[PDB]
Amino acid sequence: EGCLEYETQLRRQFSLQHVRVIPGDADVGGRLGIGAAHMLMSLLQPQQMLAIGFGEATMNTLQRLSGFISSQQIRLVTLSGGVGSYMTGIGQLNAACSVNIIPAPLRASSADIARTLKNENCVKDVLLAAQAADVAIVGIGAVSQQDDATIIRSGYISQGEQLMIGRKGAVGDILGYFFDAKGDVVTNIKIHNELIGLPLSALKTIPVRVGVAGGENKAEAIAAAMKGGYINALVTDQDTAAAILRS
Amino acid sequence: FEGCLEYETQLRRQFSLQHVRVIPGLADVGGRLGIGAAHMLMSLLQPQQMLAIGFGEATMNTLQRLSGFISSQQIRLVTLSGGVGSYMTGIGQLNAACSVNIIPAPLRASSADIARTLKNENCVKDVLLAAQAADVAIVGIGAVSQQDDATIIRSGYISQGEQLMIGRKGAVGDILGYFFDAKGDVVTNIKIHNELIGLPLSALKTIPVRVGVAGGENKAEAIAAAMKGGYINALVTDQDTAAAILRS
Ligand SMILES: CC(C)CC(=O)C(O)(O)[C@@H](O)COP(=O)(O)O
Ligand SMILES: CC(C)CC(=O)C(O)(O)[C@@H](O)COP(=O)(O)O
Numbered sequence: 001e002g003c004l005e006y007e008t009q010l011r012r013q014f015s016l017q018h019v020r021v022i023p024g025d026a027d028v029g030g031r032l033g034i035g036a037a038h039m040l041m042s043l044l045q046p047q048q049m050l051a052i053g054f055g056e057a058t059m060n061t062l063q064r065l066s067g068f069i070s071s072q073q074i075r076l077v078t079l080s081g082g083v084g085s086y087m088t089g090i091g092q093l094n095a096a097c098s099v100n101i102i103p104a105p106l107r108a109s110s111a112d113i114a115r116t117l118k119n120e121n122c123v124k125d126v127l128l129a130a131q132a133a134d135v136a137i138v139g140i141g142a143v144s145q146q147d148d149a150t151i152i153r154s155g156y157i158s159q160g161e162q163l164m165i166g167r168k169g170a171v172g173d174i175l176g177y178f179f180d181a182k183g184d185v186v187t188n189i190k191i192h193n194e195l196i197g198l199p200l201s202a203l204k205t206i207p208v209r210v211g212v213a214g215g216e217n218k219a220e221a222i223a224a225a226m227k228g229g230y231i232n233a234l235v236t237d238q239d240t241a242a243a244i245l246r247s
Numbered sequence: 248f249e250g251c252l253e254y255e256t257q258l259r260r261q262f263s264l265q266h267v268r269v270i271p272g273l274a275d276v277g278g279r280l281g282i283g284a285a286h287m288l289m290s291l292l293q294p295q296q297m298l299a300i301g302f303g304e305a306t307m308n309t310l311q312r313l314s315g316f317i318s319s320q321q322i323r324l325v326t327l328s329g330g331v332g333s334y335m336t337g338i339g340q341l342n343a344a345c346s347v348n349i350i351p352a353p354l355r356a357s358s359a360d361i362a363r364t365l366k367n368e369n370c371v372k373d374v375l376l377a378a379q380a381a382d383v384a385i386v387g388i389g390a391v392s393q394q395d396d397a398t399i400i401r402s403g404y405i406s407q408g409e410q411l412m413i414g415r416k417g418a419v420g421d422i423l424g425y426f427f428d429a430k431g432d433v434v435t436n437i438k439i440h441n442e443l444i445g446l447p448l449s450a451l452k453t454i455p456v457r458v459g460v461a462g463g464e465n466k467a468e469a470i471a472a473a474m475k476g477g478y479i480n481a482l483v484t485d486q487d488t489a490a491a492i493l494r495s
Contacts, residue, residue, distance in 0.1 A: 099332075
């Protein structure tokens with residue numbers, strides 16, 4: 001319904017490997033989890049390793065994917081710290097499920113503390129495992145969401161921080177790393193050296209990296225994520241796909 | 248004379264416990280401990296109360312038996328220790344209505360200064376406060392006598408050389424990685440103690456009901472010391488262990 005054509009155009013414009021565009025009406029957050037869970041069911045082979053990001057679209061996707069995770073013995077690994085944030089999509093599975101979790105906060109209070117935690121063995125071990133995954137699933141945050149962004153509502157940055165990240169040219173983020181409209185990570189940003197998880201440069205080792213995000217206010221962030229290479233597959237909705245293509 | 252019901256009463260009066268269950272020593276030990284211990288916690292937890300959960304085999308076994316109850320009675324759970332991952336056997340199996348509060352840190356830091364830094368991060372401190380405020384705790388008890396079989400060795404939280412020195416220094420057992428001597432006092436000069444991130448035993452004692460779940464005759468000295476120090480005020484154990492504790 002224009003969805004096949006959007007998929008084709010996004011695929012070619014951003015040189016993607018896989019794309020799914022969901023129709024334009026009741027539950028978009030929810031049909032996005034379904035769309036992405038389907039895409040993951042078709043990419044993942046039994047016993048493969050899935051690296052999981054933070055936030056609402058990803059947790060929604062994981063809840064929907066749980067019987068597939070058990071049935072196919074998929075191994076999960078956290079791309080980010082914070083632990084507890086993942087209990088909604090993990091308080092959800094079974095004890096035979098291998099779940100590999102970074103045992104640290106998502107963001108440390110100083111960059112020196114982030115570097116110390118990243119060198120602890122039990123942390124370093126999981127960071128390697130995550131970079132070795134077969135597929136990644138991640139959300140995409142947008143500066144233009146303002147107070148509605150997950151990163152603000154969770155408390156991981158302050159409003160003052162968000163304002164300055166915007167002033168500095170960032171349009172969006174993956175895993176708390178903010179990039180400009182061309183897709184380059186923005187240089188001068190305190191949270192980037194405080195985060196404990198895998199940097200975006202390392203996420204790119206994973207061969208299939210699926211972003212799941214929608215809402216027209218995310219269109220610029222999603223375009224820039226693709227231009228930067230962070231994701232090479234996308235699950236989004238029809239209005240957002242339109243907006244992305246005109247960006 | 249005697250039997251399990253007599254050991255229960257005697258353990259209760261000798262160590263001033265609030266609750267005790269001794270399961271008969273016939274099938275599967277750790278499995279039946281798990282079941283005994285879940286029934287005990289099913290009697291103690293009122294709806295929407297908070298349970299603080301320790302580390303190791305008997306606690307994880309217990310939690311698994313407790314899931315239906317945890318979900319149906321809306322029990323909130325909070326980790327007494329760091330380490331995060333170890334905790335996914337027993338809480339793995341729970342609805343998403345389940346409030347599970349987890350210390351977002353390793354179980355043991357590589358240095359005391361790193362442990363002090365992590366305890367002071369806000370997301371860590373907040374959970375350490377919630378844990379200390381729990382209504383009921385469930386912990387296991389480790390013993391120096393178990394040597395290579397001790398969960399603490401098998402999981403790699405201490406080395407063999409550490410264990411030998413801990414024993415040379417007079418320790419008999421541990422709760423949450425903290426090693427105490429035969430009278431129930433924490434042994435003072437032990438490196439792991441200042442590298443652990445979770446709640447110290449002094450703070451564990453704020454929780455009003457503290458259930459230890461442990462079995463095997465090699466643990467009898469550790470379990471007795473644990474009660475003498477006051478760390479647990481309730482016990483789930485097996486018949487032979489109970490008999491050994493009593494002749495301790
Ligand atoms: C890492 C976290 C602090 C921020 C983050 O991951 C995000 O990239 O901002 C992510 O939350 C966006 O996804 P949604 O929560 O689905 O909007
Ligand atoms: C904190 C952990 C490293 C050690 C610990 O808690 C413990 O007390 O030794 C515990 O493992 C003993 O319980 P069991 O594993 O059931 O024998």
